[PDB]
Amino acid sequence: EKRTGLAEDGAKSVYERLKNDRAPYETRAQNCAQYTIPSLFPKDSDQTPWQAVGARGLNNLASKLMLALFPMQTWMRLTISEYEAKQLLSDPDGLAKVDEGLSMVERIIMNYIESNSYRVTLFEALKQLVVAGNVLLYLPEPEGSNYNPMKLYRLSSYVVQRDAFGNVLQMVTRDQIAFGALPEDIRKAVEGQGGEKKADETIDVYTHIYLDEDSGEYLRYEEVEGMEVQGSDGTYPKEACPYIPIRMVRLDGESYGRSYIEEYLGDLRSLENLQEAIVKMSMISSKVIGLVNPAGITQPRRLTKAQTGDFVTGRPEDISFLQLEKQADFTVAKAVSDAIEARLSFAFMLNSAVQRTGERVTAEEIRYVASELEDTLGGVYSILSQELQLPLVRVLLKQLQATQQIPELPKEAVEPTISTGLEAIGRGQDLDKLERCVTAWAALAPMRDDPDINLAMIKLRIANAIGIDTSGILLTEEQKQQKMAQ
Amino acid sequence: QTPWQAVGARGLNNLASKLMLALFPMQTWMRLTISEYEAKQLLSDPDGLAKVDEGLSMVERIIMNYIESNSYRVTLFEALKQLVVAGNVLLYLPEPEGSNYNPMKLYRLSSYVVQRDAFGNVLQMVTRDQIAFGALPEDIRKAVE
Amino acid sequence: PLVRVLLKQLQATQQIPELPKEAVEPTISTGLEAIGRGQDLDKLERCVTA
Amino acid sequence: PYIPIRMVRLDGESYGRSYIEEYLGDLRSLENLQEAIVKMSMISSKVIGLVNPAGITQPRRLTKAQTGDFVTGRPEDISFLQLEKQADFTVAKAVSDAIE
Amino acid sequence: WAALAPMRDDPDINLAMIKLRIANAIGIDTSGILLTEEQKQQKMAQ
Amino acid sequence: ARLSFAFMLNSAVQRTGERVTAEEIRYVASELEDTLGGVYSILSQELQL
Amino acid sequence: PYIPIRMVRLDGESYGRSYIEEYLGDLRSLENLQEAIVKMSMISSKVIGL
């Protein structure tokens, strides 16, 4: 069947069209990668760098973020939905069974992420997210309990179109598979479409995903050499598309995202250009060249051949050694280079932005400057929890629930709330409030045996101000007199 | 074109980061409490009161759950940057509409306009989107040709 | 303004289960009050130390 | 549902002022200077030989020499072009730094 | 839990609930952390 | 020096510039731990499992 | 039982990148410089009478 809508005139033809507005982004990504790690986004179409600062910064930033966002620890938290949680009012037996299945679900997701090598690709994705605007993550249908890894498309080989509100209208990926590696059906279709193909010839395979105007849901198909692939068609519901295009830095009303490094590219290239001319300098400067005056007696052969300790026919007025003596010029260059590199280290939260060789670095300023690095990391992290973490989890839930790898739970826990960050680590806001109230209560120990002060009321008021539940914090009359008797 | 120095870049970035962690943290950040007038009514009625405070600090957690689930933090960040560099930002939050992914919309100063009265209340606004024809809704698309 | 609006939008779509009149127009604290490190707590535990 | 926000108010006016605007002077000053400084560092780090063509020392023979090599020439013919704007720099640096 | 030693002999504070709540926020199993009624009164007797 | 950070050589701490404090040693050492945790958490997925 | 391992993945590619590659520029630089310096030290240690 000929399909229409956004897929009216072929997948490849859409890819081609949308590529036009994507181009700036991939130029920008190519420039940033040039001065860090070029293999992330090479300057092929529309060699290593001199300095390694870009390289170790990017590597650092990714590592840090990946150990924050996706640690070996449990990192999401599923909890009962607010509405259904109001239902199980005065039903602890029926509740605590919900939370048991939810925290089971937690563990299943975790076991999946562990066993399908999600961490490794997430790393590569973070690098990409940092250097270029965007990554496209694709997680296929679980399909058994097999090794189901994730797939990553770097900005160069995929394309996106968003509406007014930033919702995804259509996507087109473009794999480049060698003919030999293609499935037989596809392989046969291709050569049956004319011209016999060599095993090492590469074949563009376009994958089109798009919103249908009629259905409130996505359609997908694969498309090779202008013809749709046999049984490559499919559909995805709007709220759970397994293709996730991620932006690092949003500009609303725009299909792709800006990148992190781009903001600090000015100072990065500046460093690169300088570090080059300095290294070259040092090379001229470490080269010894003698100068025998040919008007003199001292003959150069006789010098080169000499053993150490040797007396040789000559005068010292004939030989001189070519001195560079660009000694001051160097320290000006160095001072600048150093300044910039220092500025970059802060932007890559390298811990050795503390390392200043100027003065005796106190201990007290270290804590303050290290908390400027924590400040700016909290920034990217709290943005990448929304952008990368929550969508990845939300989609994994729906995917696993579809294949009944998630044993049936009671209605309450089908749409739970997904906590991430410090809550899940078990170091959250609730615990803090509780153990700040305990420390506030211990400060009325020097009046425990009160004359007429009434500890009960003050005890409850402290908890209220701080904001603990205080649902069964105070001992009731019947339970207190019961405990007074025993 | 990029700038020669990155002091401004890290400066703005710092400022926004700090502000956004202060204004919109993962913690609860608003607090809803009984109105002064109606609170005077429930004088000597604790049982009837702390039920109000119970439904309110429910409301808190609902708003919070929405802000978490609808990516409010990420757009607030971009808005704070905008707010610092250009004088003003425009936030648009559409009708919840089911229980779906309803994000917020941001209009930079360049693509919206405002007129205020004497007392500074809003009289009119006019935003200006710039959509590719292909992305438009079919009804509009067909009107346009 | 952000909060005030959300309240009115959520109460419109009855994504906010009905509460008794008192809590339809409440007062919206922000800042330190909410964090649980406010003026009230300070005054209390300054009175305990006195 | 449309909320137009201002950063810094000026009463009786539809739009708001910005935070950075207040400090723009010192910011553009910085940007002008750090430019002129960066460019300085590129001049200063560039080696350029000067072989006196009245002389004996021929430049082809200097560029082709290995390290350790002895070569026909006199050190009155080669000189390396020095920028020595060492003091002028630290003036510019002092000011840049003060602003930063 | 060692931080509520300066109020172990509580007047009307209820250690039981706060002890379980701390464990929940941290996120231990709490599957048989509290002493049950029959097992507690058994231990009080012995 | 730069390469020593990249190879997590402990003696990237060793700077002859200044009297190296005790408090910065810890902080710079944990840059090396940071970047080691990086390669390790990858190679655990790539090589170990 | 054949396990081919990659260090640094590039999705859609059969072989992996290396860890050192990312820092090779600074490494060859050192090698070149250290060579010219060691060679300097042999010229500097050599006594020749005239």
> What is the residue-wise DSSP string for A36-50?
S-GGGS-SS-----S
At A258, the amino acid letter reads R
Does chain D reach chain G with at least 3 CB pairs under 8 Å?
Answer: yes
Radius of gyration of chain F (CA): 13
CA dihedral C26, C31, C34, C40 (to 10 degrees): -90
CB contact under 8 A, D1 and B93: yes
Distance from CA of A481 to the nearest CA of B (A): 23
Give A86's contacts in chain B (Cβ within 8 Å): 58
* Cross-chain Cβ contact B91/C7 below 8 Å: no
Q: Report the alpha-carbon distance of residue B117 to residue B122 in Å, rounded.
A: 7
Q: How many cross-chain Cβ pairs, D to G, lie less than 8 Å apart?
A: 7
Chain breaks in chain G (C to N over 2.5 A) after: none
Residues from chain D contacting residue G39 (CB–CB below 8 Å): 67-68
Distance from CA of F47 to the nearest CA of G (A): 7
CB contact under 8 Å between A39 and G10, yes or no, is yes
Q: Are A212 and A219 in contact (CB under 8 A)?
A: yes
Bridge pairing between strands A310-311 and G48-49: parallel
Helix or strand or coil: residue D51?
A: strand
Distance from CA of D16 to the nearest CA of C (A): 16
Whether residues A443 and C49 touch (CB distance < 8 A) is answered with yes
Half-sphere exposure of A470 (CA within 13 A, CB side): 19
Which two three-digit tokens encode residue A324?
Answer: 């560079």
* Cα–Cα distance, A285 to D47 (Å, whole number): 10
CA distances from A43 to A68, A256, A294, B119 (A): 31, 20, 51, 56
Q: Resolution for this model in angstroms, one decimal place?
A: 3.4
In chain E, the largest separation of any two C-alpha atoms, in whole Å, equals 33
Closest alpha carbon within chain G to A297: G50
Q: Which of A439, A475, A480 sits opposite E3 (nearest CB)?
A: A439
Q: How far apart are CA A259 and CA A22, in angstroms?
A: 14
CA distance A293 to G5: 61
Beta bridge partners of A78: A418
| Nearest by Cα to E18 from A445, A472, A481, A464 | A472
- B129 CB contacts (<8 Å, ≥6 apart)? A164, A253, B111
Structure tokens at A153: 């498309």
∠ at Cα B42 (B41, B43), nearest 5°?
A: 85
Of C15, C23, C34, the CB nearest to B56: C23
**Least CB-CB distance to G50: which of A39, A48, A312?**
A312
| Alpha-carbon distance values, D65 to A292, A297, A309, D61 (Å) | 13, 22, 25, 6
The identity of residue A356, as a single letter, is R
D88 CA: distance to closest CA in chain B (Å): 20
Which residue among A278, A288, A319 places its CB closest to the CB of D45? A278
Distances (CA, A) of A454 to A446, A447, A461, B87: 14, 10, 12, 54
Q: Which two tokens stand for residue A319?
A: 């030989």
Q: Which residues pair with A410 in a beta bridge?
A: none
Sign of CA dihedral A446, A449, A450, A454: positive
Which chain C residue's Cα is nearest to B91? C2
DSSP letters for A367-404: HHHHHHHHHHHHHHHHHHIIIIIHHHHHHHHHHHHHTT
Residues A31, F1 contacting (CB under 8 angstroms): no
Give, as one character, the DSSP assignment of residue D3. E
And the tokens for D12? 């009786």
Handedness of CA F42, F45, F49, G2 (dihedral sign): negative
Residue that the structure tokens 């009731």 belong to: A476
Structure-token pair, residue E30: 């709490």
Element housing A77 (H / E): strand A77-79
Distant-in-sequence contacts of A293-302, Cβ < 8 A, 24+ apart: A293/A317, A293/A318, A293/A319, A293/D56, A293/D73, A293/D74, A294/D56, A294/D72, A295/D56, A295/D74, A298/G50, A300/D70, A300/D71, A300/D72
Residue B125 pairs with which residues in a beta bridge?
A: B114
Rounded Cα gap, residues A450 and A461, in angstroms? 17
**In chain A, what residues touch B108 (CB-CB under 8 Å)?**
252
Q: Give the span between the Cα atoms of A412 and A102, in whole angstroms.
A: 10
Length of chain F: 49
Q: How many CA atoms lie within 13 A of A448 on its CB side?
A: 13
Strand order in the sheet with A134-138: A151-154, A134-138, A243-247
Residues 6+ apart with CB under 8 A from C6: B63, B66, B67, B93
**Distance between CA atoms of residues A128 and A155, nearest Å:** 8
CB-nearest partner of E14 from A426, A435, A473: A473
Burial of A464 by CB count in 10 Å (0-12 exposed, 13-18 middle, 19+ buried)? middle
Residues on chain F touching A72 (C-beta within 8 angstroms): 41
Token pair 């701390």 in the structure block, residue: E22
Interface present between F and D (3 or more CB pairs within 8 Å): no
Count of Cβ atoms closer than 10 Å to residue B109 Cβ: 18
Question: Are the C-beta atoms of residues A76 and A102 closer than 8 Å to each other?
Answer: no
Rounded to whole angstroms, the Cα distance separating A65 from B44 reads 53
Q: In the beta sheet, which residues pair with residue A160?
A: A171
CA–CA gap between residue A160 and residue B134 (Å, rounded): 13
Which residues, other chains included, contact D49 with Cβ-Cβ below 8 Å and sequence gap of 6+?
Answer: D59, D62, D78, D79, D80, D81
Q: Chain D partners of A277 at a C-beta cutoff of 8 Å?
A: 42, 45-46
**C-beta of residue A117 within 8 angstroms of C-beta of residue F36:** no
Record the tokens describing residue A240, joined without a space.
Answer: 């759970």
Helix (H) / strand (E) element for A193: namely none
- List of chain E residues whose C-beta atoms are within 8 Å of the C-beta of residue A440: none
d(CA C16, CA A153): 41
Give the residues across from A220 on adjacent strands: A209, A234
CB contact under 8 A, B6 and A213: no
SS3 content of chain G, % helix, strand, coil (to 5): 50, 10, 45
Q: Point out the residue among G5, G19, G26 whose CB comes nearest to the CB of F3.
A: G26
